[PDB]
Design a protein around this ligand. Structure first.
Ligand code: HEM
Ligand code: HEM
Lengths: 153, 153
């Protein structure tokens, strides 16, 4: 089906992306990971999102998550994600056409033992998809947990 | 990777399923839909779930959702789902090995305008996957919205 007019401003996302990231937090040792993301659609005002990650040295599967991006013509967007670890998140924010960026902060984090808020910020930089994920916990304020850069395949 | 021992009791789910369902609610006219579900895994104690639905007469895409099933050896299970419509849900309940059934009720429904609780009940019947989804709204008590039966492909 054709791309819905609400999805068209984010059409740069559509496809498969692969790259690598670094994870961190004051409470844990830093680590690296490989990541692959697919964004797809079915003609609705919604983009399907799927992630998988792995250990670089072994290819051993790590975290996965999936969900839906719902952009609107006023530049607002909501994103819902379920994670393999048993969390859900509702993200709300805005996208910027000139910057090809998306800025989100959680309205809800469900089924967490420790996490309170999550923010996710994406930007296309020289055609590569970059993001930073920040989180707050019961013992730590909102700060980075993940950063990755992915090439479009 | 091999099936994780926590996933093995639900190994009957793994694969792709296709069939059809009927949707209803006191507030809406009844409708029919086609559905396809995939259950997969990556060696973790987690089963990935993806759904798509369509109009039977046209093949036109309808609802999609995705998430993760997390069974444990005591017979408990939690399921997290994100829906294309912008909802998230945390489901908790139990599975029964002798019946090949799974019974879930929501601990949380996020980003809903109307829905309060959702329950989902699955059973394998003569090798086919059957489910009933019930929901409560601001104006209606917990009752069926969806029922479907799918054949394993
Ligand atoms: C928004 C998504 C994510 C959230 C909310 C999240 C949350 C957390 C939390 C709360 C911790 C424990 C910190 C503590 O104990 O103080 C943690 C640790 C960790 N995370 Fe994440 N995580 C996310 C994504 C990921 C991803 C994508 C990966 C791998 C690619 C990952 C790998 C790890 C690892 C290796 C640890 C240390 C071991 C552990 O406690 O499990 N996380 N994460
Ligand atoms: C647990 C999953 C679902 C939930 C919580 C849900 C929720 C709802 C709600 C709250 C309504 C409005 C009822 C009212 O206004 O009183 C509705 C209507 C409807 N639903 Fe569902 N739904 C789900 C799954 C599905 C699926 C899988 C389909 C299609 C295959 C579907 C198709 C429809 C249709 C055609 C209507 C009537 C038009 C509309 O209001 O959108 N729903 N649903």
């Amino acid at each position: 089906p054709p791309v819905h007019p609400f999805v068209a401003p984010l059409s740069y996302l559509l496809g498969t992306w692969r790259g690598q990231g670094e994870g961190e937090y004051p409470t844990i040792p830093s680590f690296r990971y490989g990541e692959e993301i697919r964004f797809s659609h079915s003609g609705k005002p919604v983009i399907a999102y799927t992630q998988k990650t792995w250990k670089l040295e072994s290819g051993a599967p790590m975290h996965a998550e999936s969900g839906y991006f719902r952009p609107r013509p006023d530049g607002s967007i909501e994103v819902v994600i379920a994670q393999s670890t048993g969390l859900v998140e509702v993200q709300k924010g805005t996208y910027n056409v000139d910057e090809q960026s998306i800025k989100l902060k959680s309205d809800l984090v469900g089924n967490a033992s420790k996490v309170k808020e999550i923010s996710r910020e994406f930007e296309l930089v020289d055609g590569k998809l970059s993001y930073v994920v920040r989180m707050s916990t019961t013992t730590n304020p909102l700060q980075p947990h993940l950063k990755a850069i992915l090439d479009k395949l």
